[PDB]
């Protein structure tokens, strides 16, 4: 399969999430995603076909994971944007007020600004510390997906948000949206991963 940020994958043939970013660990191909998306050894599928397994995850506390992929998979330095894409050029931190976009399988490509840093999410499952908050909308299934700038800098992966009864927070004013992201760099560092760039 082509590995691109934002695309759908399934876990245990039971649940859905979004790819974060293509990465390598030496010769091993992978993608980063959210920790709450899977458990260690859980099977990932794209288009209903096995592509790899969860190699490692942390959730709660943090919310991060990576999926180790078969060598047949095709890593692309890309984030999906409708029928187009955005090329991943590198990674950076992002400051309050920065323009960003996220990509995922439920609400697609949505843009907004960073509204806060160092946010704790009191999820029912447990607290997650250190999150970036933005006002781009999201919905159930967008978790794990890319957070990037339009210029191609990878910033994070989606952790969660204030989803409403319709399954997203696109229907409420931007001022009321809390969309939350795990910073990318600690993921790459913890797991010895290199971001695939173009």
Curated annotation (Swiss-Prot):
Spell out where the chain crosses the membrane: none
Q: Does the keyword Transport apply?
A: no
S-S pairs: 17-37, 101-111, 137-170
Keyword terms, alphabetized: Disulfide bond, Hydrolase, Protease, Serine protease, Signal, Zymogen
Keyword Magnesium among record annotations = no
Task: Please give one Gene Ontology molecular function term for this protein.
Answer: serine-type endopeptidase activity
Q: Which residues form the active site?
A: 36, 63, 143
The cellular component terms of Gene Ontology attached to this UniProt record, alphabetical and capped at eight, are: extracellular region
Might you name a Gene Ontology BP term for this protein?
proteolysis
For this chain, the family text in UniProt reads: Belongs to the peptidase S1 family.
Protein name, entry field: Alpha-lytic protease
* Originating species: Lysobacter enzymogenes
What is the gene called? alpha-LP
Shown residues in whole-protein numbering = 200 to 397 of 397
């Amino acid at each position: 399969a082509n590995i691109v940020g934002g695309i759908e994958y399934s876990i245990n043939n039971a649940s859905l999430c979004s790819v974060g970013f293509s990465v390598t660990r030496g010769a091993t191909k992978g993608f980063v995603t959210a920790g709450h998306c899977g458990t260690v050894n859980a099977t990932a599928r794209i288009g209903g076909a096995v592509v790899g397994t969860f190699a490692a995850r942390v959730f709660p506390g943090n919310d991060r994971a990576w999926v180790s992929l078969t060598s047949a998979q095709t890593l692309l330095p890309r984030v999906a944007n409708g029928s187009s894409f955005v090329t991943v050029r590198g990674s950076t931190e992002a400051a309050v007020g920065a323009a960003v976009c996220r990509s995922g399988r439920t609400t697609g490509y949505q843009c907004g600004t960073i509204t806060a840093k160092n946010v704790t999410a009191n999820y029912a499952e447990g607290a997650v510390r250190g999150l970036i908050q933005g006002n781009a909308c999201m919905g159930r299934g967008d978790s794990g997906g890319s957070l990037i700038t339009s210029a191609g800098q990878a910033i994070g992966v989606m952790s969660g948000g204030n989803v409403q009864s319709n399954g997203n927070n696109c229907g409420i004013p931007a001022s009321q949206r809390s969309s939350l992201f795990e910073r990318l760099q600690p993921i790459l560092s913890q797991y010895g991963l290199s971001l695939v760039t173009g």
